[PDB]
């Protein structure tokens, strides 16, 4: 419509004016904010064979302050933008307004609870409240989309809007509408793309007012169950997705804008190492082979990466962790098979153009195979190739299968193997069979065994084949050459030669076996060999390997290697590859150019030689250096009582006063004289903290007090120096009735009740007009026995300024409330020199909040990836504690002792400084009249990476200054 470089079909996304299948995976630059590893991962993905990453912007981040717009430093998308550009990644927007996205508010800032209207629709109140943050974020957009020569082809307004209640007219056409309209007016001229949550058809081409361009709908078919990885429950394989499309949007390509990579773990949950066992290889070659026979053009993987909650950024129900098992780990690390797994079929769908031009039927438990324990859906295609995609009917089974197919192919139907045996399916594995299929004019009749990837070179064609171990297979060229093992034995291989064609017939085998056909080189690999392969593109005009354009991919290399190939480039003599090693590792390289005489690794001239058949042999030796990091123990802490609001000399006057008679939060209206939520004072984010003044009469018996701070969220309560309780917290508890007995009060003398508050981070808003995001925080009733409520005189305070916060560079919600947090201690080289010393391994004898301070130095080497871990310590059941650890003033730790389940947390290079000094600070909070200490703080490592990333920046850590507006 608005522009020709990206256009569409019935089949497919254009681009320039050539078909692609966007494979894509989600990755959110705000949980992960250091460039260079931003880089990293965007290599990481285009190493899977995708082209696209899709990525949402919070806007909670970036608007702190109403009217003031934020993204730079950590928060800039433009870096971002050019690390996708430098890697050779489209990209898919998703500036929201609402994000959902596990994170604090869905996206809104905290500010939206004071809005007179309903979230996500269209009262004038919400809409006006987004024009600001939008006419920003999708104008910096508008600038790097491809048009204007950058990385982004696609962008979606809204986020799953999908359920409405309470009195919307639900779908809102003029809401979508005007959604749109902001986009546009800000200069995005790309096509607009949805989400539904479900296949429901809502906004899709034809619905009129409010419809995007392409209909994409969501799905999470195998749930979030990661307690029990192993159970696949019965009909979650969905078949109708096809049906569906037809019905809803029959002229756009099929797209699953976000098709579960991973799964969320809440408080208290088994732990993301049992979600990565879920969402498993198995997982992904059963269920995204599945997406392939409904000939899905747009896939999204949510998340490939997900990274950390830092700074209070997530959501309540969640955790620091953000891992969400997903192929990359929170730790950047690719060792999960789930890796190597989807990099199989990412190859297979770059080079494989008759899968988008094919006509896809019913699947079917007959005709194509002979047992109905077997399930085929085929993707026929006239001249350009046909597809078989095999599972068993039973999509949970774990049975071995015997099978013959019957395949139709331009030389006619064929009845496979020919030359004897059977084919296997073992257990929870799909295979997409081809028949026809085009090796650059080399026509493969068909194979069952799986494409990896194919290559014509100046001197030939290489195809690559997979099988799993103990299957046999079996393929058919159109040719009048013999075939001739060049490699490996020949047991094992039979053949037969017709008067047009060759068949050849094999067993998978751990040693690989290469054929010779005319000038068609076959390697035969089983599956776990195959995950050692690597395609990268060949840059001859510089060092980048571009966009997946037809054109690069074709100039591609096949690389035998070990962790990861990241790119190649030629330039002179010089072969060029960028790669990383866990291990020492043959290289391998096929396909090398004439004119290259000499390899060079990571810059570094590597000794070769050339086998009989071409391929470049050399090996890069693993010798790690001793890693040495610092006993946290050991360490000079200094200590500083956080909590020096229950002392009776403290000074609360320049506090703000919560004497605001009527709420803005139309969501739930005041049970208290005054409004005690924090959000309608400012306060976000953080642990709160309220002060209610009175005078006693000397019959007071009880204060009763309900606290809200979502899923497991705590609170303590003193009465000047006594300690009154704590709720500990329960992922089941978003609030709290505590009934406290007071001691003995004096008539007539002043009395303080403190109160500290654990905000876990605003909910989110799923369902339009429920208004959740609007859920306050802070106390929402009180009784003084005997009393009037208005006994009670309240001030409180969240992060200092609240709104007009004080870190620009560390962002809106990184730090909360607490004494040390407002006057800027958490940063580097707080004035800790007089302090106590004291460690959080010795800690607390009473409640209280305790704060500690210590430096480290890394002397970490350079050429090597390192990953650095913090842990604390529950080898036996602790006493309830809450911890957050800053790391150089960035909150990279939130720990609840008796909730869990993370011990492990990682910090990434950027935040600390590998080569330098780094700060911890620790707040330690012990919700036991008894107090409470850590176990253990340790610092670990995993394996270092032999690596070629470049130099990572630390990014700006602002030392520790004293603060104008402090309470002091
Ligand atoms: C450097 O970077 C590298 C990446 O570039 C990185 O390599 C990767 O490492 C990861 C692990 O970190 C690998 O992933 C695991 O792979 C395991 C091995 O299975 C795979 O490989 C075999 C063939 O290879 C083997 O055999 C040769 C010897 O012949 C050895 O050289 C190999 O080391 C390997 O041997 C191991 O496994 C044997 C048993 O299989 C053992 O006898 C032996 O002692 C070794 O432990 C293939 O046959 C496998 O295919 C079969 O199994 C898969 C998966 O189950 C099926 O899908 C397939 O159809 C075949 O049947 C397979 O490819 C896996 O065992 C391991 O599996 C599990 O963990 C994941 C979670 O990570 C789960 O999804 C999965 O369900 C499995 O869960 C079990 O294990 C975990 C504990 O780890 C439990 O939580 C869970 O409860 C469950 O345990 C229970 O069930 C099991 C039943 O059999 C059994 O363990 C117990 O009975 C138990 O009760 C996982 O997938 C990855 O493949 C590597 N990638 C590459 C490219 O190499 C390397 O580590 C990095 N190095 C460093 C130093 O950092
Ligand atoms: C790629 O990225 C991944 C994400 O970043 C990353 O995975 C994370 O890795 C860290 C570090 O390894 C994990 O933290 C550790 O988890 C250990 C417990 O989990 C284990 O328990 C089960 C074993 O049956 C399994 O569930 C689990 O395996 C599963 O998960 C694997 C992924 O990790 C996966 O590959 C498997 O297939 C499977 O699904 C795993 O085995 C935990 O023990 C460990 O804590 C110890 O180590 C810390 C660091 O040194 C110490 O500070 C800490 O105190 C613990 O050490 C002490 O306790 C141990 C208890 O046995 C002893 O072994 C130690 O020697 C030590 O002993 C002292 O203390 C004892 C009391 O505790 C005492 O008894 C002793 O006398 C002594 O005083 C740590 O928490 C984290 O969970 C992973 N995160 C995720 C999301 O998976 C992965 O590693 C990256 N890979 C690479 C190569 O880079
Ligand atoms: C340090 O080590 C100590 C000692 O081991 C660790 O302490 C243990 O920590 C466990 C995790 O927090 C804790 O188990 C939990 O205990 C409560 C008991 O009431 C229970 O609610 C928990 O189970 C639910 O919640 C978790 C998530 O927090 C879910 O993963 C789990 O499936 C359960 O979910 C159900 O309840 C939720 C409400 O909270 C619902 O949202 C959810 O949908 C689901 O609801 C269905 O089932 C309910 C009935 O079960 C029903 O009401 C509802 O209608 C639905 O049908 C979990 O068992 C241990 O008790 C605790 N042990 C000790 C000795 O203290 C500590 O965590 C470790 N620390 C670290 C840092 O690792
Ligand atoms: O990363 C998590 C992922 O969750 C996805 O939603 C999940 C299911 O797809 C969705 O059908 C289900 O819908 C729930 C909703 O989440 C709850 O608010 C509930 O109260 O109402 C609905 C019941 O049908 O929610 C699942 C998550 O638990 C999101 O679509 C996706 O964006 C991610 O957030
Ligand atoms: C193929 O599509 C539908 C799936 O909804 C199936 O029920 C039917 O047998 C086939 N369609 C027709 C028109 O026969
Ligand atoms: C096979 O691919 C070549 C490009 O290498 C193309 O010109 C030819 O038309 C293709 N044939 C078919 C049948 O798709
Ligand atoms: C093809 O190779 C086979 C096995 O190596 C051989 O026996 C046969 O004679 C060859 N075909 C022709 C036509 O020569
Ligand atoms: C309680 O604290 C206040 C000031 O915070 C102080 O003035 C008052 O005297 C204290 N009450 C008692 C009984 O000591
Ligand atoms: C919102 O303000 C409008 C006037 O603009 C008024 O009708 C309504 O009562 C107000 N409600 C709340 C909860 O602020
Ligand atoms: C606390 O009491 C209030 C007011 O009666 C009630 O509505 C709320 O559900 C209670 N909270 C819990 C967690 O039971």
């Given at each position: 419509?608005?522009q020709?470089?990206?256009?569409?079909?019935?089949?497919?996304l254009?681009?320039?004016?050539?078909?692609?299948?966007?494979f894509?995976?989600?990755?959110?630059?705000?949980?992960?904010?250091?460039?260079?590893?931003q880089?990293?991962?965007?290599?990481?993905?285009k190493?899977?064979?995708?082209?696209?990453?899709?990525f949402?912007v919070d806007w909670?981040?970036?608007e702190?302050?109403?009217?003031?717009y934020?993204?730079?430093?950590?928060?800039?998308?433009?870096?971002?933008?050019?690390?996708?550009?430098?890697?050779g990644?489209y990209?898919?927007?998703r500036?929201?307004?609402?994000?959902?996205?596990?994170?604090?508010?869905?996206?809104?800032?905290?500010?939206?609870?004071?809005?007179?209207?309903t979230?996500?629709?269209?009262?004038?109140?919400?809409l006006?409240?987004?024009?600001?943050?939008?006419?920003?974020?999708?104008?910096?957009?508008?600038?790097?989309?491809?048009?204007?020569?950058?990385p982004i082809?696609?962008?979606?307004?809204?986020?799953?809007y999908?359920?409405?209640?309470?009195?919307?007219?639900?779908?809102?056409?003029?809401?979508?509408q005007y959604?749109?309209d902001?986009?546009?007016?800000?200069?995005?001229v790309?096509?607009?793309?949805?989400?539904?949550?479900s296949?429901?058809?809502?906004?899709?081409?034809?619905?009129?007012?409010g419809?995007?361009?392409?209909?994409?709908?969501?799905?999470?078919?195998?749930?979030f169950?990661?307690?029990?990885?192993?159970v696949?429950?019965?009909?979650?394989?969905?078949?109708?997705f096809?049906?569906?499309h037809?019905?809803?949007?029959?002229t756009?390509?099929?797209?699953?804008?976000?098709?579960?990579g991973?799964?969320?773990?809440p408080?208290?949950?088994?732990?993301?190492?049992?979600?990565?066992?879920?969402?498993?290889?198995?997982?992904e070659?059963?269920?995204y082979?599945?997406?392939?026979?409904?000939?899905?053009?747009?896939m999204?993987?949510?998340?490939?990466?997900?990274?950390t909650?830092?700074?209070?950024?997530?959501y309540?129900?969640?955790?620091?962790?953000?891992?969400?098992?997903?192929?990359?780990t929170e730790?950047?690390?690719?060792?999960?098979?789930?890796?190597?797994?989807?990099?199989?079929?990412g190859?297979?769908?770059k080079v494989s153009?008759?899968?988008?031009?094919?006509?896809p039927?019913?699947l079917?438990?007959?005709?194509?195979?002979?047992?109905?324990?077997?399930?085929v859906?085929?993707?026929?295609?006239?001249?350009?190739?046909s597809?078989?995609?095999?599972?068993?009917?039973?999509?949970?089974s774990?049975?071995?299968?015997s099978y013959?197919?019957?395949?139709?192919?331009?030389?006619?139907?064929?009845?496979?193997?020919?030359?004897?045996?059977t084919?296997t399916?073992?257990?929870?594995?799909?295979?997409?069979?081809?028949?026809?299929?085009?090796?650059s004019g080399?026509?493969?009749?068909?194979?069952?065994?799986?494409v990896?990837?194919?290559?014509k070179?100046?001197?030939?064609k290489?195809?690559?084949?997979?099988?799993?171990?103990?299957?046999?297979?079996?393929?058919?060229?159109?040719?009048?050459?013999?075939?001739?093992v060049?490699?490996?034995?020949?047991?094992?291989?039979?053949?037969?030669?017709t008067?047009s064609?060759?068949?050849?017939?094999?067993?998978?085998?751990?040693?690989?076996?290469?054929?010779?056909?005319?000038?068609?080189?076959?390697?035969?690999?089983?599956?776990?060999?195959?995950?050692?392969?690597?395609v990268?593109?060949?840059?001859?005009?510089?060092?980048?390997?571009?966009?997946?354009?037809?054109?690069?991919?074709?100039?591609?290399?096949?690389?035998?290697?070990?962790?990861?190939?990241?790119?190649?480039?030629?330039?002179?003599?010089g072969?060029?590859?960028?790669?990383?090693?866990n291990?020492?590792?043959?290289?391998?390289?096929?396909?090398?150019?004439?004119?290259?005489?000499?390899?060079?690794?990571?810059?570094?001239?590597?000794?070769?030689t050339?086998?009989?058949n071409?391929?470049?042999?050399?090996?890069?030796?693993?010798?790690?250096?001793?890693?040495?990091?610092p006993?946290?123990?050991?360490?000079?802490?200094?200590?500083?009582?956080?909590?020096?609001?229950?002392?009776?000399?403290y000074?609360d006057?320049?506090?703000?006063?919560?004497?605001?008679?009527?709420?803005?939060?139309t969501?739930r209206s005041?049970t208290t004289p005054?409004?005690?939520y924090?959000?309608?004072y400012?306060?976000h984010?953080?642990?709160?903290?309220?002060?209610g003044?009175?005078?006693?009469?000397?019959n007071?018996?009880?204060?009763?007090?309900?606290?809200?701070?979502?899923?497991?969220?705590?609170?303590?309560?003193?009465?000047?120096?006594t300690?009154?309780?704590?709720?500990?917290?329960?992922?089941?508890?978003?609030?709290?009735?505590?009934?406290?007995?007071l001691?003995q009060?004096?008539?007539g003398?002043?009395?303080?009740?403190?109160?500290?508050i654990?905000?876990?981070?605003?909910?989110?808003?799923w369902?339009?007009?429920?208004?959740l995001?609007?859920?306050?925080?802070?106390?929402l009733?009180?009784?003084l026995?005997?009393?009037?409520?208005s006994?009670?005189?309240?001030?409180?305070?969240?992060?200092?300024?609240?709104e007009?916060?004080?870190?620009?560079?560390?962002?809106?919600?990184?730090?909360?409330?607490?004494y040390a947090?407002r006057?800027?201690?958490?940063?580097?080289?707080?004035?800790?020199?007089?302090?106590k010393?004291?460690?959080?391994?010795?800690?607390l004898?009473?409640?209280?909040?305790?704060?500690?301070?210590?430096?480290?130095?890394l002397?970490?080497?350079?050429?090597?990836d390192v990953?650095?871990?913090?842990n604390?310590?529950?080898?036996?059941?602790?006493?309830?504690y809450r911890?957050?650890?800053?790391?150089?003033?960035?909150?990279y730790?939130?720990?609840?002792?008796?909730?869990?389940?993370?011990?492990?947390?990682?910090?990434?290079?950027?935040?600390?400084n590998?080569?330098?000094?780094?700060?911890?600070?620790?707040?330690?909070?012990?919700?036991?009249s008894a107090?409470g200490?850590?176990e253990?703080?340790?610092?670990?490592?995993?394996?270092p990476?032999?690596?070629?990333?470049?130099?990572?920046?630390?990014?700006?850590?602002?030392?520790?200054?004293?603060r104008?507006?402090?309470?002091?």
């Amino acid at each position: 419509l608005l522009q020709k470089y990206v256009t569409w079909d019935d089949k497919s996304l254009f681009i320039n004016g050539e078909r692609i299948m966007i494979f894509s995976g989600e990755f959110h630059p705000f949980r992960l904010p250091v460039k260079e590893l931003q880089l990293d991962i965007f290599q990481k993905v285009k190493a899977l064979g995708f082209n696209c990453v899709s990525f949402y912007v919070d806007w909670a981040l970036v608007e702190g302050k109403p009217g003031e717009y934020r993204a730079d430093g950590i928060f800039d998308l433009e870096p971002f933008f050019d690390a996708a550009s430098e890697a050779g990644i489209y990209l898919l927007a998703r500036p929201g307004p609402y994000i959902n996205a596990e994170s604090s508010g869905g996206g809104f800032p905290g500010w939206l609870q004071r809005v007179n209207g309903t979230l996500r629709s269209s009262d004038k109140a919400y809409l006006d409240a987004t024009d600001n943050y939008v006419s920003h974020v999708a104008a910096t957009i508008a600038k790097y989309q491809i048009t204007n020569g950058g990385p982004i082809i696609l962008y979606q307004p809204e986020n799953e809007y999908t359920s409405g209640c309470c009195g919307v007219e639900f779908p809102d056409p003029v809401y979508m509408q005007y959604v749109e309209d902001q986009a546009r007016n800000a200069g995005v001229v790309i096509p607009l793309i949805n989400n539904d949550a479900s296949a429901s058809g809502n906004n899709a081409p034809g619905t009129g007012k409010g419809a995007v361009d392409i209909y994409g709908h969501d799905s999470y078919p195998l749930g979030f169950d990661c307690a029990n990885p192993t159970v696949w429950p019965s009909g979650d394989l969905p078949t109708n997705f096809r049906t569906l499309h037809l019905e809803q949007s029959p002229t756009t390509p099929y797209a699953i804008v976000q098709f579960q990579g991973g799964s969320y773990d809440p408080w208290g949950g088994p732990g993301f190492a049992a979600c990565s066992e879920l969402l498993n290889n198995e997982f992904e070659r059963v269920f995204y082979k599945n997406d392939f026979s409904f000939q899905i053009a747009i896939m999204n993987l949510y998340m490939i990466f997900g990274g950390t909650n830092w700074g209070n950024l997530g959501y309540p129900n969640g955790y620091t962790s953000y891992d969400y098992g997903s192929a990359v780990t929170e730790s950047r690390n690719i060792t999960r098979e789930k890796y190597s797994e989807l990099k199989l079929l990412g190859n297979f769908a770059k080079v494989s153009p008759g899968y988008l031009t094919a006509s896809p039927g019913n699947l079917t438990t007959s005709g194509y195979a002979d047992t109905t324990d077997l399930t085929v859906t085929p993707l026929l295609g006239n001249s350009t190739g046909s597809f078989f995609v095999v599972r068993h009917s039973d999509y949970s089974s774990e049975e071995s299968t015997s099978y013959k197919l019957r395949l139709p192919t331009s030389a006619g139907s064929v009845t496979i193997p020919q030359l004897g045996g059977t084919l296997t399916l073992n257990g929870r594995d799909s295979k997409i069979h081809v028949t026809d299929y085009n090796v650059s004019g080399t026509n493969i009749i068909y194979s069952t065994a799986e494409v990896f990837t194919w290559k014509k070179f100046a001197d030939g064609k290489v195809l690559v084949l997979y099988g799993g171990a103990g299957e046999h297979h079996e393929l058919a060229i159109s040719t009048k050459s013999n075939v001739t093992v060049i490699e490996g034995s020949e047991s094992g291989i039979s053949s037969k030669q017709t008067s047009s064609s060759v068949v050849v017939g094999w067993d998978v085998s751990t040693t690989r076996r290469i054929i010779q056909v005319g000038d068609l080189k076959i390697l035969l690999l089983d599956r776990n060999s195959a995950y050692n392969y690597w395609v990268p593109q060949l840059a001859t005009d510089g060092t980048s390997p571009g966009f997946s354009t037809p054109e690069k991919v074709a100039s591609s290399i096949i690389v035998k290697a070990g962790y990861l190939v990241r790119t190649a480039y030629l330039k002179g003599s010089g072969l060029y590859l960028t790669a990383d090693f866990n291990a020492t590792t043959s290289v391998e390289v096929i396909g090398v150019p004439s004119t290259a005489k000499n390899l060079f690794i990571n810059g570094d001239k590597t000794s070769h030689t050339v086998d009989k058949n071409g391929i470049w042999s050399a090996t890069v030796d693993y010798n790690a250096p001793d890693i040495s990091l610092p006993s946290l123990k050991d360490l000079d802490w200094k200590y500083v009582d956080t909590l020096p609001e229950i002392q009776s000399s403290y000074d609360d006057s320049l506090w703000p006063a919560a004497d605001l008679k009527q709420t803005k939060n139309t969501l739930r209206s005041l049970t208290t004289p005054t409004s005690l939520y924090s959000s309608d004072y400012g306060f976000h984010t953080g642990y709160l903290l309220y002060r209610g003044h009175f005078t006693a009469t000397g019959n007071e018996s009880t204060f009763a007090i309900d606290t809200q701070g979502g899923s497991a969220f705590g609170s303590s309560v003193w009465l000047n120096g006594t300690y009154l309780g704590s709720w500990t917290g329960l992922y089941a508890n978003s609030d709290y009735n505590a009934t406290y007995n007071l001691p003995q009060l004096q008539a007539g003398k002043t009395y303080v009740i403190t109160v500290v508050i654990d905000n876990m981070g605003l909910e989110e808003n799923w369902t339009v007009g429920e208004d959740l995001m609007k859920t306050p925080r802070g106390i929402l009733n009180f009784l003084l026995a005997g009393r009037p409520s208005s006994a009670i005189s309240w001030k409180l305070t969240g992060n200092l300024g609240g709104e007009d916060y004080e870190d620009k560079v560390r962002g809106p919600l990184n730090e909360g409330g607490l004494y040390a947090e407002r006057q800027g201690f958490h940063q580097p080289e707080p004035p800790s020199q007089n302090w106590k010393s004291s460690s959080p391994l010795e800690g607390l004898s009473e409640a209280g909040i305790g704060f500690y301070s210590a430096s480290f130095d890394l002397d970490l080497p350079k050429g090597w990836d390192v990953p650095l871990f913090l842990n604390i310590g529950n080898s036996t059941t602790p006493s309830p504690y809450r911890v957050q650890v800053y790391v150089n003033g960035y909150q990279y730790a939130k720990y609840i002792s008796n909730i869990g389940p993370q011990t492990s947390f990682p910090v990434p290079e950027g935040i600390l400084n590998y080569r330098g000094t780094n700060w911890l600070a620790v707040t330690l909070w012990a919700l036991d009249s008894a107090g409470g200490k850590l176990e253990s703080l340790e610092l670990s490592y995993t394996t270092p990476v032999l690596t070629a990333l470049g130099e990572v920046e630390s990014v700006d850590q602002p030392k520790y200054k004293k603060r104008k507006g402090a309470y002091h």
